[PDB]
Design a protein around this nucleic acid. Structure first.
Ligand SMILES: Nc1ncnc2c1ncn2[C@@H]1O[C@H](COP(=O)(O)OP(=O)(O)OP(=O)(O)O)[C@@H](O)[C@H]1O
Ligand SMILES: Nc1ncnc2c1ncn2[C@@H]1O[C@H](COP(=O)(O)OP(=O)(O)OP(=O)(O)O)[C@@H](O)[C@H]1O
Ligand code: NA
Ligand code: NA
Lengths: 50, 220, 228, 224
RNA sequence: UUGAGCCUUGAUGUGUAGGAUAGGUGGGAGGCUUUGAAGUGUGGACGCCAGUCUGCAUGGAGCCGACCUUGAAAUACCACC
């Protein structure tokens, strides 16, 4: 309920997004996580953006 | 007097034709002068946006009817070309700091990529009236002497207004109707080819032809 | 018509506002009202583009020449009066400083001849020739003299620093975002002068002025950024 | 509506300044010549003027940021002076949060209550007390300065221009606090119905002639 | 009567530097002047009141453009807006 859904879009330019939850009131900070990008098949940065 | 007689002798509400228009314009001849007849096309362009600004220079086959004091501001090859094609200004900043400073002004400035100090020397002195070398018109070109020679042949230049209009002398009224008609056709073709690509709507709405002391009539 | 599309900005636990979508534009003049600390000073930064929202867009028109200013004048005491009045027309300033690379650059290449040839064309096309005249007209119409022209930023009163820095906004600039015109309380006479010139000259302005009578005199539409 | 009420740690009895002469003119002709006046623990004295008359530099020379070219001022030795400066940007620096900023003051107080409570009594929250105090804007900074004044509980408030950025709903709270204030103050606020609300001992400055105590400002502005 | 669009005629349009309430387009420094002129006498209209404009005979045929203070040039001017 309080935890809101977000999505982590890829920074490789391809359209591939992971999705996850985030507590919207701690501080608004775009999540910065290195995750696998199956379109390019390499680890890149996934800046969150819905 | 002339206003109050010509506003009843000629009516501008109705449109005219390319045949009777020249006849009327040569019929006016009110004042003692050469009376260089001029044309004015009411272009349709969003002149508020830079890309739709139309700047150009065409070469009519019957000269500009004046003298072109085309200073070939190009050191070396530009100066040699100016000497070959009658350049009344050698290519060097001296002709813009000592001779140009004392002098009143030149007619045209043919630029060269070798010795062009006028690019900062002219400033607001010779550029306030539109005498700078426009790269889009060919001022900054590989040929300096060739451009100077082409200018004397009738290389007239036009630039749109704030409200998207282009008026410029079409020729001297001493010329014939056939000469005026073909010069107008060449100018219209050049402007049509020089229209910008992102120009919505009809971009040629009105064409007027007028005399320096007489009135003007709608030629189409 | 700059249009906001679901603009929402958050600072910590509670968002300043949520789901902001208003089509600002037309011919009318807007001004927004709100308790300080709630938007107002962040909304216009979002609109200008100095700070993107946590969600939403600005959707600015391509060439309407949005007009912004550096509002507080007690934090940039280095850039002198002439310095800060020369640095509104961004295209004009950049073409001016690129054309200034002729007396600076000791020579030029063949391509750079064409570069400067079109640079001075663009100079004339946005009227860099009359730029000094218009800047001087504004500068000596607000009420600073030629004597105080080249003097530093700090050693003049803010009651005149507002006068000089307003000239950075009115560079024939439609769609200006003028922040607090009161604060550093003006002499009512200058407020009235600004009101009259703003009402005369045509543009779209967004203001966050705090004076009821001043807003009554000038503005036409009122954006209440109060509840959410 | 924030709830601000400046108290008094110690009461002053006789007078505050007893100023005689300053002879302060920066570069041109002095904007004021003599300026010999007292307070007898008076009140208000709303200095007014146009944009460029010298109220703020007079206040600076009065407090001690600057000093007069020739003369003396001298305060009462038991006094305590609070200062809402004209510019407040030299204060909000050095990356101090709201809580640390308002806790750097205080004489003998607790670092959990009376510093975190003096914040809540003026439109601030648990979220607010942790954000850096530099990124505050306008009315928040003004209320921070008012909180510093309340925390310091000074005898004499100089308060250059209090009505600068306020909400017009914090203006009412400020007026209530100033009326309920039993200490001493000067201020140069240019607002009309602020000096009309509280001022009674006008000190009108002007480059050639200075006015001292025309009255309750209504005789002043009806004569002129 | 009162709002809106369209066409036409004719009006309308300062700074700061000073001669003068000096929009651009730039093509031109020689045109304008008795198909009755400089200003006189007499009224309009408007107006950051210094000033623009128009019926008007007469008076009877010069004012100007430059030079110039300038970002620009000067209702010499004809068009289109
Ligand atoms: N960079 C930042 N980091 C954290 N909080 C911030 C930041 N910038 C602003 N804030 C806070 O966000 C809120 C929005 O205030 P903001 O500056 O947008 O209001 P304003 O309308 O300009 O203020 P005023 O009431 O002074 O006119 C305030 O509580 C402010 O302290
Ligand atoms: N650093 C300075 N340099 C030059 N003049 C100054 C300086 N500081 C003050 N002055 C002069 O002193 C006069 C009075 O000072 P002050 O700054 O209080 O004026 P004010 O405009 O009435 O006040 P404020 O705008 O700060 O509310 C000003 O009008 C200004 O002419
Ligand atoms: Na604000
Ligand atoms: Na002051």
């Amino acid at each position: 309920g309080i935890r809101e859904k977000i999505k982590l879009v890829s920074s490789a330019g391809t359209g591939h997004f992971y999705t996850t939850t985030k507590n919207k009131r701690t501080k608004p900070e775009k999540l910065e996580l290195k995750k696998f990008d199956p379109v390019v098949r390499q680890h890149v940065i996934y800046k969150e953006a819905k | 007097k002339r206003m109050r007689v010509i506003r009843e002798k000629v009516d501008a509400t109705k449109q005219y034709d390319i045949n009777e228009a020249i006849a009327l314009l040569k019929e006016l001849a009110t004042a003692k002068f050469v009376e260089s007849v001029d044309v004015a096309v009411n272009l349709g362009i969003d002149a508020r946006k830079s890309d739709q600004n139309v700047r150009g220079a065409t070469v009519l086959p019957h000269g500009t009817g004046r003298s072109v004091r085309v200073a070939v501001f190009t050191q070396g090859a530009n100066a040699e070309a100016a000497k070959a094609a009658g350049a009344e200004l050698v290519g060097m900043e001296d002709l813009a700091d000592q001779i140009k400073k004392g002098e009143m002004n030149f007619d045209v400035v043919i630029a060269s990529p070798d010795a062009m100090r006028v690019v900062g020397q002219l400033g607001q002195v010779l550029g306030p009236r539109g005498l700078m070398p426009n790269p889009k018109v060919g001022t900054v070109t590989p040929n300096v002497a060739e451009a100077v020679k082409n200018a004397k042949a009738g290389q007239v230049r036009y630039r749109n207004d704030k409200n998207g209009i282009i008026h410029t002398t079409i020729g001297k009224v001493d010329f014939d109707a056939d000469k005026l008609k073909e010069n107008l056709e060449a100018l219209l073709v050049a402007l049509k080819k020089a229209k910008p690509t992102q120009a919505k709507g009809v971009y040629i709405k009105k064409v007027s032809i007028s005399t320096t002391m007489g009135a003007g009539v709608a030629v189409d | 018509m700059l249009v906001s599309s679901n603009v929402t900005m958050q600072f910590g636990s509670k968002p300043l506002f949520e789901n902001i979508s208003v089509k600002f534009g037309g011919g009318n003049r807007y001004g927004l009202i709100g308790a300080n600390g709630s938007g107002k000073s962040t909304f216009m930064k979002i609109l200008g583009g100095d700070l993107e929202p946590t969600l939403g867009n600005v959707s600015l028109d391509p060439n309407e020449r949005i007009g912004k200013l550096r509002q507080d004048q007690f934090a940039f005491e280095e850039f002198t009066v002439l310095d800060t009045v020369i640095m509104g027309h961004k295209e004009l300033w950049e073409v001016k400083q690129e054309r200034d690379r002729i007396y600076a650059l000791p020579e030029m290449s063949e391509e750079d001849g064409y570069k400067v040839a079109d640079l001075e064309v663009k100079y004339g096309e946005m009227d860099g020739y009359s730029a000094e005249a218009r800047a001087g007209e504004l500068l000596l119409g607000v009420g600073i003299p030629v004597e105080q022209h080249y003097g530093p930023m700090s050693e003049v009163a803010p009651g005149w620093k507002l006068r000089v820095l307003l000239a950075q906004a009115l560079f024939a600039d439609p769609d200006i975002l003028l922040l607090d015109q009161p604060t550093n309380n003006l002499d009512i006479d200058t407020i009235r002068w600004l009101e009259q010139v703003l009402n005369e000259r045509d543009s779209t302005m967004i203001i966050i002025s705090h004076d009821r009578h001043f807003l009554n005199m000038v503005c036409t539409h009122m954006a209440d950024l109060d509840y959410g | 509506n924030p709830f601000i009420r400046f108290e008094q740690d110690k009461k002053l009895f006789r007078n505050a300044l007893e100023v005689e002469g300053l002879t302060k003119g920066f570069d041109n002709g002095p904007l004021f010549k003599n300026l010999n006046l007292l307070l007898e623990v008076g009140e208000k004295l709303a200095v007014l003027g146009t944009n460029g008359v010298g109220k703020s530099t007079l206040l600076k020379t009065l407090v001690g940021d600057l000093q007069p070219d020739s003369g003396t001022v001298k305060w009462s030795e038991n006094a305590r002076i609070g200062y809402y400066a004209q510019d407040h940007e030299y204060e909000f620096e050095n990356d101090l949060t709201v809580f640390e900023w308002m806790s750097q003051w205080k004489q003998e107080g607790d670092d959990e209550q009376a510093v975190r409570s003096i914040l809540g009594r003026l439109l601030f929250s648990q979220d607010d007390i942790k954000k850096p105090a530099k990124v505050l804007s306008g009315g928040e900074k003004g209320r921070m300065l008012f909180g510093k004044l309340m925390m310091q509980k000074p005898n004499i408030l100089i308060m250059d221009q209090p009505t600068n950025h306020l909400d017009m709903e914090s203006i009412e709270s400020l007026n209530m606090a100033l009326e309920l204030y039993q200490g001493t103050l000067i201020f140069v606020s240019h607002d009309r119905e602020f000096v009309s609300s509280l001022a009674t001992r006008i000190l009108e400055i002007t480059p050639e002639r200075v006015i001292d105590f025309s009255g309750n400002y209504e005789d002043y502005l009806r004569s002129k």
